[PDB]
Amino acid sequence: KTVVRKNESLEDALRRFKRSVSKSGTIQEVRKREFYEKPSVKRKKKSEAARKR
Amino acid sequence: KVCYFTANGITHIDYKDTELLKRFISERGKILPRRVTGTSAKYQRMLTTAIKRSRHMALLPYV
Amino acid sequence: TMTDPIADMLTRVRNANMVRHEKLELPASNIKKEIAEILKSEGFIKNVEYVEDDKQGVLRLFLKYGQNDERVITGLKRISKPGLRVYAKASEMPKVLNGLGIALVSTSEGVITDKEARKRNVGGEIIAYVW
RNA sequence: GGUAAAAAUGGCAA
RNA sequence: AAACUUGAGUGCAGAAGAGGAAAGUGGAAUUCCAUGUGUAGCGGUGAAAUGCGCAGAGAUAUGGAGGAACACCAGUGGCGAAGGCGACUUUCUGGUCUGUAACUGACGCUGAUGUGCGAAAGCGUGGGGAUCAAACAGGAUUAGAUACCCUGGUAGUCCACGCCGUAAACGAUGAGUGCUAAGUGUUAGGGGGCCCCUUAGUGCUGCAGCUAACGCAUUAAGCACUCCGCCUGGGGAGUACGACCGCAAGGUUGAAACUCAAAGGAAUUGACGGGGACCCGCACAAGCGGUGGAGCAUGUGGUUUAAUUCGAAGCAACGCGA
Ligand SMILES: [Mg+2]
Ligand SMILES: [Mg+2]
Ligand SMILES: [Mg+2]
Ligand SMILES: [Mg+2]
Ligand SMILES: [Mg+2]
Ligand SMILES: [Mg+2]
């Protein structure tokens, strides 16, 4: 939980908030589970994305 | 990076050893990937069973 | 598992010859030593050495490469096989490459070339053709 | 993240 | 007949693993139900609507019920004959790898017929039912829309025990064994000085050789030997008939008449694409003035006529040959 610092802008706090969300990866997870992907497809995506990484 | 367990000659990970385990988990309680930590394959497996055992006994958080 | 040790020997020779290896080592047997001795005698191979190993022995063959690295052995083929054994009468003994090559024959007079077999008028199992 | 929506058909020869 | 230890096993000392079966224990989330706060929408799409809500929805807070699946870890990572196997715990249980060299002493390989296992859907009996979702029903789209999209929704998806026996069940690559350049990553070991050597996997790159080519290349599609299965132009046809198996669905086996001169594989040059990149042109955009409406001139079509001469026909015929 980002807490606004003393003498810190809400906009500055918002920057900190956005970064923490990115590291958490909650957005990433949400998009993946929007629609069902068959087991074989899931495994392929995991592999090739890792190949990219 | 370097494997802590290999470097420090630790061959068994206790789920009861919370202090060690807290270093290998994220702030959200997520288990950290072995690339980031530098843990070996054999120890990533050991540690991870320990984290799951520790979470069961509420020594560590699930989230 | 291993079914034809003779065929293995000839393949090892073929494979080493392709890559122009100077020498090859193989597990030894009395038949394989006799085959090697004919190849040296016919000028296909330089030398044969036998090493005792407390198992079945080891044969070391040194291959011959002519000037310009031309290979003295062009080809080897197994004729008689475990799946199908091939025998010939002395009259029917085959000529390999019109006499340019040799046939190794197992006869009651020993393991010999096709020329010796025709001379001695003794036929037998055709082990292989070497040319 | 996206995404605009719709979007049919056309003789065999030479 | 007698030996041998290299194959194949056994012992001994180590190693890793989502291998399998059965109980038990968690946490996240979804749905529903119950209350509190609260208010005019929510939901959904390309846009909508159906739907839900004002009988207080959605949202937010807390509690309860139930089912299913296990984020992160997580990796051409691991294990398994294949199908497959991913929370954790315990119990039972299979296989594999390394080292050693106690022991046995060729005890091996393959494998017709057999006999078992075998994703998913499906079937039977009983149980369960959160989510998702064939069928089905609305809404929408459309020329139509028995679809795609939206709101719902039953079987089914789950469990047990039987049945079915099939998948692009794929590496479209049968099994065993040996041999044949290197380089690099990774998993589980072993050995010797971070480096080197080595065993068994798992990837990438790449010789020789092979291949129609694409490619393969110690994880061969190279070079060899053993054994098994399978092929012999396309269609008809995996159909017919018979047989066997199945509760059924169907499975396995499996023709012919007739008909054609082709079916095909790979690669090449083009063309094309509701493929991509990059660029242009009054192509669009930004503007200005027109045409299509009126009268008339003129060409054309058509119709008419004795003849309305002939030629031009999307752009690139039609105030065109003239
Ligand atoms: Mg056409
Ligand atoms: Mg099923
Ligand atoms: Mg639907
Ligand atoms: Mg089949
Ligand atoms: Mg390897
Ligand atoms: Mg006008």
Curated annotation (Swiss-Prot), chain A:
Cellular component terms per the entry's GO annotation: ribonucleoprotein complex; ribosome
Keyword annotations of the record: Ribonucleoprotein, Ribosomal protein
Ribonucleoprotein is among the record's keywords: yes
GO biological process: translation
Pfam family membership, one: Ribosomal_S21
Keyword presence, Isomerase: no
Gene Ontology molecular function: structural constituent of ribosome
Residues annotated as signal peptide: none
Family (UniProt): Belongs to the bacterial ribosomal protein bS21 family.
NCBIfam families for the chain: S21p
Protein name from the UniProt record: Small ribosomal subunit protein bS21
From Swiss-Prot, chain B:
GO cellular component terms, semicolon-separated: cytosolic small ribosomal subunit
GO BP terms: translation
Protein function: Binds as a heterodimer with protein bS6 to the central domain of the 16S rRNA, where it helps stabilize the platform of the 30S subunit.
Lineage: superkingdom: Bacteria
Protein encoded by which gene: rpsR
GO MF: small ribosomal subunit rRNA binding; structural constituent of ribosome
The family this protein is said to belong to: Belongs to the bacterial ribosomal protein bS18 family.
Quaternary organization: Part of the 30S ribosomal subunit. Forms a tight heterodimer with protein bS6.
UniProt source species: Staphylococcus aureus (strain NCTC 8325 / PS 47)
Keyword terms, alphabetized: Ribonucleoprotein, Ribosomal protein, RNA-binding, rRNA-binding
Name used for this protein in its record: Small ribosomal subunit protein bS18
UniProtKB/Swiss-Prot annotation, chain C:
Any Pfam family hit: Ribosomal_S8
Keyword RNA-binding appears in the UniProt entry: yes
Chain's role: One of the primary rRNA binding proteins, it binds directly to 16S rRNA central domain where it helps coordinate assembly of the platform of the 30S subunit.
Subunit structure: Part of the 30S ribosomal subunit. Contacts proteins S5 and S12.
Alphabetical list of PANTHER family matching this protein: 40S RIBOSOMAL PROTEIN S15A
Entry similarity comment: Belongs to the universal ribosomal protein uS8 family.
NCBIfam families, alphabetized: PRK00136.1 (NF001109)
Protein name from the UniProt record: Small ribosomal subunit protein uS8
Organism expressing this protein natively: Staphylococcus aureus (strain NCTC 8325 / PS 47)
